[PDB]
Design a protein around this ligand. Sequence first.
Ligand SMILES: NC(=O)c1ccc[n+]([C@@H]2O[C@H](COP(=O)([O-])OP(=O)(O)OC[C@H]3O[C@@H](n4cnc5c(N)ncnc54)[C@H](OP(=O)(O)O)[C@@H]3O)[C@@H](O)[C@H]2O)c1
Ligand SMILES: CN(Cc1cnc2nc(N)nc(N)c2n1)c1ccc(C(=O)N[C@@H](CCC(=O)O)C(=O)O)cc1
Length: 159
Amino acid sequence: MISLIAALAVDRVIGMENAMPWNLPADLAWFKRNTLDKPVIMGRHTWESIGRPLPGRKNIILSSQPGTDDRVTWVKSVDEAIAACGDVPEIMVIGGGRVYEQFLPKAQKLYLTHIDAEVEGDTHFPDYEPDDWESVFSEFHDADAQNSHSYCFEILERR
Ligand SMILES: NC(=O)c1ccc[n+]([C@@H]2O[C@H](COP(=O)([O-])OP(=O)(O)OC[C@H]3O[C@@H](n4cnc5c(N)ncnc54)[C@H](OP(=O)(O)O)[C@@H]3O)[C@@H](O)[C@H]2O)c1
Ligand SMILES: CN(Cc1cnc2nc(N)nc(N)c2n1)c1ccc(C(=O)N[C@@H](CCC(=O)O)C(=O)O)cc1
């Protein structure tokens, strides 16, 4: 199966200027926990923000254009990307915008990080529709020394 993994602030805002308007070390942690050992599909922009491969996971990139780091596997099509994974039980789609937009429909599970912060952003998340999804997991956390905002994890299966 396919899965999207994202962190959303208030208004489904996912980021500003090739960045994330926040800093939650704890999300990264949860993020990694959820991805370790699985293939991650990302996009040229996302990729560019990461800047280096992600250890323990198969880094697949989407670019219309030519691969520019031999360390990571590049692709020119959703189908390619999807191909590039293989016989795995779960493929993780890690962003950004456009990519989410495109795989949402194929997804069957979501790992969300609801961040309690109202911030302006230029990229929002694909509008999912409640009806379809069944929240099967939540986990709250208050802001801290390091995670300046409170946040909540959630897991939803497509009903
Ligand atoms: N908050 C989170 O949960 C989360 C997770 C990831 C990313 N993000 C944020 O998302 C924002 C950036 O996302 P974005 O949508 O602008 O970029 P993106 O999806 O990361 O990058 C888009 C690039 O994908 C390539 N592409 C996409 N679909 C393709 C396809 N089917 N075939 C070929 N190439 C394809 C194009 O590449 P070319 O250059 O090859 O034309 C396109 O410019 C950021 O601020 C980032 O930090 C947030
Ligand atoms: C910019 N970006 C994309 C990013 C970030 N947080 C997200 N958070 C969630 N929940 N989902 C995403 N798709 C997501 N994507 C990043 C940036 C850094 C790392 C990264 O450093 N990951 C380390 C975590 C520890 C660290 O940064 O030192 C890992 O090993 O997975 C991952 C994604």
